[PDB]
């Protein structure tokens, strides 16, 4: 609901109408299989000494 | 005036972000990935005159 004020006509649009709003991930970049089924996981690096 | 100069050279010669094309939050069914970019900037000195 966030309004934009056209440029057109002078009109007042909701974000929703020049867009598409949704809960998603930050970055898209890995995605893991386990046993041919999606999870996640985490690597574990150990220190030096 | 001297900064209407500096904001002229701003304009005309600009970098622009490259990007790809195809890249990961995608459409079911995209075969082929490929960088795009753009050559903003200037090169000689007939173009800056």
Redesign the interface.
Known sequence: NISLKSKTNGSVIKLSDVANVEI?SQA??FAILENGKPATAAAIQLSPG | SISDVNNAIRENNVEIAPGRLG???AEKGQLITIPLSAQGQLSSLEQFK
């Open positions: 998603g898209y970049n | 890249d990961l939050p």
